[PDB]
Tab-separated table of C-alpha atoms in Angstrom:
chain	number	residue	atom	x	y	z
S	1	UNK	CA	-2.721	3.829	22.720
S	2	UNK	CA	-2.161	7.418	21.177
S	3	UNK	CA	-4.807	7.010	18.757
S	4	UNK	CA	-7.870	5.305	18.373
S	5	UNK	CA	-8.634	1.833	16.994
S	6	UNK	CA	-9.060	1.952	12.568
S	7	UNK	CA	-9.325	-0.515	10.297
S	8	UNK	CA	-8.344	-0.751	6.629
S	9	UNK	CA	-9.430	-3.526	4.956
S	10	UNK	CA	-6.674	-4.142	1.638
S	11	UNK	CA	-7.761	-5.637	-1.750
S	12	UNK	CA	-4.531	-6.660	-3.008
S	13	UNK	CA	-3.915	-7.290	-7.117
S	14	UNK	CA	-0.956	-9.251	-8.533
S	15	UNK	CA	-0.117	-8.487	-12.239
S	16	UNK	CA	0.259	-10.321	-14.708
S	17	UNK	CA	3.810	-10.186	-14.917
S	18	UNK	CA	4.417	-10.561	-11.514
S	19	UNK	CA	2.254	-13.915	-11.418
S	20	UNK	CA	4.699	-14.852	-14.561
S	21	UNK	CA	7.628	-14.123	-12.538
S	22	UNK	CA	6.421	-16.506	-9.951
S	23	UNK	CA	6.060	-19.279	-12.158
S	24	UNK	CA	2.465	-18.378	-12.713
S	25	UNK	CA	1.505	-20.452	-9.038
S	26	UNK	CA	-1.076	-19.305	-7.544
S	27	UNK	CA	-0.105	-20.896	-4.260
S	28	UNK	CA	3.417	-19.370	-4.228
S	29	UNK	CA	1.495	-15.641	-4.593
S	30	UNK	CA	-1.000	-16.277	-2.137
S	31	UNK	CA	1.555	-16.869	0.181
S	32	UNK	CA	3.855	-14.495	-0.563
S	33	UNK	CA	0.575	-11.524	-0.575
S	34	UNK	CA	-0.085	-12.917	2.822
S	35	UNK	CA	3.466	-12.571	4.044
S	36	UNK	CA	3.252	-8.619	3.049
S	37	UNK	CA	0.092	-8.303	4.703
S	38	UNK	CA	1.230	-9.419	7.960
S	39	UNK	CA	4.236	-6.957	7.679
S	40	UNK	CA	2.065	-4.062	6.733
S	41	UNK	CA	-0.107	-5.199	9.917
S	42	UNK	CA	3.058	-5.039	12.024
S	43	UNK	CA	4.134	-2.056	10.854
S	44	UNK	CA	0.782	-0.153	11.486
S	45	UNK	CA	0.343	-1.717	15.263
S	46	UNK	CA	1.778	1.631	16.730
S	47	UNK	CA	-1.078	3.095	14.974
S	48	UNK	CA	-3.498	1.150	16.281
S	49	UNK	CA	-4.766	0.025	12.714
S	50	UNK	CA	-5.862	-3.593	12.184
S	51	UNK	CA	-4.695	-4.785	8.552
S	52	UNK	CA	-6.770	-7.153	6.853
S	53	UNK	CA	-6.626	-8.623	3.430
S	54	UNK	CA	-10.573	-8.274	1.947
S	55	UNK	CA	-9.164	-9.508	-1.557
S	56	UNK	CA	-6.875	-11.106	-3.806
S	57	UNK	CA	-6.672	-10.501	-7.163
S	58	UNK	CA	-4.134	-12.399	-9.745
S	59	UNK	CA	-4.394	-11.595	-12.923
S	60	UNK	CA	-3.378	-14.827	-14.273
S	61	UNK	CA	-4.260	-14.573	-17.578
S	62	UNK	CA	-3.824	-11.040	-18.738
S	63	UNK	CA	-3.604	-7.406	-17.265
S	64	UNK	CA	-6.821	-5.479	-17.484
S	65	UNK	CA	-5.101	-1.930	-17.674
S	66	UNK	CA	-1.883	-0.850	-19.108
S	67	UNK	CA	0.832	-1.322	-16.178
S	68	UNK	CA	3.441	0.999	-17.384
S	69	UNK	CA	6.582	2.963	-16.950
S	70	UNK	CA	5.409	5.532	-15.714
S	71	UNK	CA	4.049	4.971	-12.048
S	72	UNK	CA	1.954	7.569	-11.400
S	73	UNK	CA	-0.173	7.185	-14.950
S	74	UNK	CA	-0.346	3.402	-13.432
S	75	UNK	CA	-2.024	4.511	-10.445
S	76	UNK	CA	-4.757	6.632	-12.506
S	77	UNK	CA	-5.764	3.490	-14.938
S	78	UNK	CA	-5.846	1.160	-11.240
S	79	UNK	CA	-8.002	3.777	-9.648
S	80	UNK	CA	-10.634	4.018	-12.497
S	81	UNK	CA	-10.467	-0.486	-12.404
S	82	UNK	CA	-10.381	-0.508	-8.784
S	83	UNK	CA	-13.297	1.736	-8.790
S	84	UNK	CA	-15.012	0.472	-11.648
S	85	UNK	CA	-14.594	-3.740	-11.293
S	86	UNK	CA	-12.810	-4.705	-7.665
S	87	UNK	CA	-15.014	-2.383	-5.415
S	88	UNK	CA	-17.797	-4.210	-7.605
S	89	UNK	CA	-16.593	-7.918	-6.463
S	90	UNK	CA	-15.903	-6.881	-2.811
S	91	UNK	CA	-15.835	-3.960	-0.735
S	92	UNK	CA	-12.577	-2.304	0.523
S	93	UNK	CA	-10.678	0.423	1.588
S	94	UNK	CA	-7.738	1.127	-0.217
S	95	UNK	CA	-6.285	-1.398	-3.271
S	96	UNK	CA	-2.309	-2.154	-4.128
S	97	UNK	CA	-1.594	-3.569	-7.620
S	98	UNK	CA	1.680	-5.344	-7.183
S	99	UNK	CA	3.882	-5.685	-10.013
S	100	UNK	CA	7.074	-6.586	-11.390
S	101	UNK	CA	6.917	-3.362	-13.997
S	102	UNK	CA	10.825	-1.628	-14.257
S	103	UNK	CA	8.663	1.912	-13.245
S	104	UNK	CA	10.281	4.763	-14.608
S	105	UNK	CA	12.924	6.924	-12.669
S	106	UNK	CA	13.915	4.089	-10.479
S	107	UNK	CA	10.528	3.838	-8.956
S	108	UNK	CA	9.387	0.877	-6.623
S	109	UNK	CA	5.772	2.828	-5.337
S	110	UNK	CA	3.681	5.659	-5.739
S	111	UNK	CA	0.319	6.592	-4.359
S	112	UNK	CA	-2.046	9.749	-3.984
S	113	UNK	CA	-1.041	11.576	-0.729
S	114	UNK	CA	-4.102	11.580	1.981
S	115	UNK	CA	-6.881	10.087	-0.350
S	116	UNK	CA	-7.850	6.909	1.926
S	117	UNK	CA	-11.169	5.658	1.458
S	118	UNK	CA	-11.587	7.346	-1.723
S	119	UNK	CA	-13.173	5.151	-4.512
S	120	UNK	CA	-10.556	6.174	-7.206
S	121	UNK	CA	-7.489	7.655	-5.059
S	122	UNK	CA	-7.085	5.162	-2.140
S	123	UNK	CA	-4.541	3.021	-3.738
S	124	UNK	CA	-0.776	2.520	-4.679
S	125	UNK	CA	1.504	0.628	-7.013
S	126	UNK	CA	4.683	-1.229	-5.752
S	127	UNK	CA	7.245	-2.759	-7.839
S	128	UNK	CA	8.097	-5.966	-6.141
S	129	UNK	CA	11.766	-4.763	-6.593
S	130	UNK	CA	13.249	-7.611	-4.040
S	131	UNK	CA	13.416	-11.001	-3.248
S	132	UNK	CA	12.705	-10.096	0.359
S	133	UNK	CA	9.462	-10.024	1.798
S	134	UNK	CA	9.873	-6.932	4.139
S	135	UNK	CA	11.724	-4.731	1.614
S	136	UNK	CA	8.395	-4.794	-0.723
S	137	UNK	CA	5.923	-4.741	2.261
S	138	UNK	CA	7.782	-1.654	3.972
S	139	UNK	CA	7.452	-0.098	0.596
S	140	UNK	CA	3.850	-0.864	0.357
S	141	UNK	CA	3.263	0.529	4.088
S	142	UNK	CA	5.352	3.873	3.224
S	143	UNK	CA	2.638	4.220	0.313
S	144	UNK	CA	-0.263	3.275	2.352
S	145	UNK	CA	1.194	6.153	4.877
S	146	UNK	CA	1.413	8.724	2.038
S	147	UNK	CA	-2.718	7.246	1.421
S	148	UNK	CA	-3.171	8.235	5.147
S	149	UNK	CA	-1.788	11.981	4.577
S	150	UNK	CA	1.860	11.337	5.508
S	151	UNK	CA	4.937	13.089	3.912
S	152	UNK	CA	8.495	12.169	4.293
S	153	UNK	CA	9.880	12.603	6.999
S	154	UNK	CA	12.250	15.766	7.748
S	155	UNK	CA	14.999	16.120	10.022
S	156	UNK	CA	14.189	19.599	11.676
S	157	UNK	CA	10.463	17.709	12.398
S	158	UNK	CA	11.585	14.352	13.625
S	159	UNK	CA	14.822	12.674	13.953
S	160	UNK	CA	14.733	8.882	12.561
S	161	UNK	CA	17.049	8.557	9.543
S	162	UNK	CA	15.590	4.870	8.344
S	163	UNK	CA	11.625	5.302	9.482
S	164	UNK	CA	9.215	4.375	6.840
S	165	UNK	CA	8.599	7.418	5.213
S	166	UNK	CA	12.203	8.399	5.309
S	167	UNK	CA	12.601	10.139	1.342
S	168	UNK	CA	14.614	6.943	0.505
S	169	UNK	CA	14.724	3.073	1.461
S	170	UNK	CA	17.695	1.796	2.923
S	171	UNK	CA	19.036	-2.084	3.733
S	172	UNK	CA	18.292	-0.520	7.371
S	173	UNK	CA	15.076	-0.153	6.828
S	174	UNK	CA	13.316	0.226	9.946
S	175	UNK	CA	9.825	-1.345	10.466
S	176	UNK	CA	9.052	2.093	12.966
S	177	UNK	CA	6.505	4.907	11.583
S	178	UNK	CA	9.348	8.375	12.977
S	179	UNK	CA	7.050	11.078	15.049
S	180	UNK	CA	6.774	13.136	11.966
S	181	UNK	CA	4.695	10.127	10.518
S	182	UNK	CA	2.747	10.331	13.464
S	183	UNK	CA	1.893	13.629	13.717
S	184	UNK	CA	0.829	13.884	9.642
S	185	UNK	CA	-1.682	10.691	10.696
S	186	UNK	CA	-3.203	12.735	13.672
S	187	UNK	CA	-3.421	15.405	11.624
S	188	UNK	CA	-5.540	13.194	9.169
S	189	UNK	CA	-7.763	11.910	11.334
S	190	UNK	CA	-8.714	14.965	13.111
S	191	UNK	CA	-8.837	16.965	9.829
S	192	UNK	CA	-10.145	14.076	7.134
S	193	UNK	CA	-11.087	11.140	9.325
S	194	UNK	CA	-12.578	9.447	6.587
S	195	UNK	CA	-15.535	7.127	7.655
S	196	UNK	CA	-13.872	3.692	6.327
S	197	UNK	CA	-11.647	3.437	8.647
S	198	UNK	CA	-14.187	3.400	10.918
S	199	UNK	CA	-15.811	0.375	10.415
S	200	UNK	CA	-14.292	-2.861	11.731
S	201	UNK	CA	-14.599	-6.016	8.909
């Protein structure tokens, strides 16, 4: 392999208006978290990182922070919960709250750029902006890259035009992680290699 065996377990958390938009069943969600998870597991076996889902979380009663427009403030209020209440239920190494929230500026994801492991910065929010499976997942992978200290890519660095951190999705989306990806992710572990990674479930 070109790099060594990690592991990041996910705690995944479905809002509340995404478990609304699913016809608040729990079963339908379940299935359709697990469905991303095995994507994002896919995508990530070039890395050599085995994807696990620690935890699911569906709020289906009522969202415990403010899931708004803007998706970067988002991000802040699910840091301080995930830090606060989820790590508290069941460790993890990075959290995704999943939502059906029209983000501002036509955003489906955001995440803090190489801050995996961390108790407040290793998570993301993703929009579940379509009704297929890999479209959401590859966006929650391209933020879980960003997590593990990847830009976009860049065309004088690397050549793949629909990799996973291209600057933009595409209905090509590729499932492939371009060499610029891979080079930012060697660059983390030999520069950051953050100890949860480390540790097999």
């Amino acid at each position: 392999q070109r790099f060594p065996q990690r592991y990041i377990e996910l705690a995944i958390v479905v809002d509340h208006g995404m478990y609304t938009k699913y016809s608040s069943n729990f079963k339908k969600i379940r299935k359709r978290v697990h469905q991303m998870v095995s994507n994002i597991n896919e995508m990530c076996r070039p890395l050599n990182i085995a994807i696990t889902l620690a935890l699911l979380d569906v709020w289906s009663e009522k969202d415990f922070i403010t899931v708004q427009a803007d998706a970067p403030t988002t991000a802040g209020l699910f840091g301080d919960w995930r830090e606060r209440v989820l790590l508290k239920k069941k460790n993890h190494d990075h959290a995704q709250l999943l939502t059906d929230t029209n983000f501002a500026r036509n955003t489906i994801g955001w995440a803090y750029v190489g801050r995996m492991c961390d108790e407040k910065y290793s998570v993301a929010v993703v929009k579940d902006h379509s009704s297929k499976v890999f479209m959401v997942a590859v966006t929650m992978t391209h933020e879980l890259g960003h997590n593990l200290g990847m830009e976009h890519d860049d065309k004088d660095k690397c050549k793949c035009d629909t990799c996973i951190m291209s600057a933009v999705i595409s209905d090509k989306q590729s499932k492939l992680f371009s060499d610029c990806s891979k080079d930012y992710y060697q660059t983390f572990l030999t520069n950051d290699n953050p100890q949860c990674i480390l540790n097999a479930p």
